[PDB]
Amino acid sequence: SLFNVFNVTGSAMSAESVRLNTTSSNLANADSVSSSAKDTYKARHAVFGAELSDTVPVKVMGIVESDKPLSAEYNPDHPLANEEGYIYKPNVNVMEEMANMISASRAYQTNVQVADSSKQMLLRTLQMGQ
């Protein structure tokens, strides 16, 4: 059933698009000390999943923050400074976010190729006999 392929590729593109938006929010918040919720932003990472047990779609089961410590900065005159003058910043790593941007885009585009190629197979089956 090549229609099941469209579900797997379609679920893959959804998963890769979630990771790209997560990467976008990490780059936009690599220097954000404050937040709406009173807790410092932590680098986010969507968790992919596979229900292997034929076609196994990839599903996003939630966003999980990185456990690395928040990068402390010595800013004693800052209004949000603690007793020792340290302000805490997100633990976003620039190099690892660029790799995620490259990986998410390439993984997104290769699933379009599979969906397009699988589309041709179904159309060719419609021509069988006739």
Partner: protein, 32 residues
Amino acid sequence: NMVAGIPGALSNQPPADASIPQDVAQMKDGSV
């Protein structure tokens, strides 16, 4: 069983770099 984890940069690291949360790394084996 279900297998899962963070993809991309964080997982493609040596375990010493503790970027991956401990419980998420557990999921990368098997679950049910």
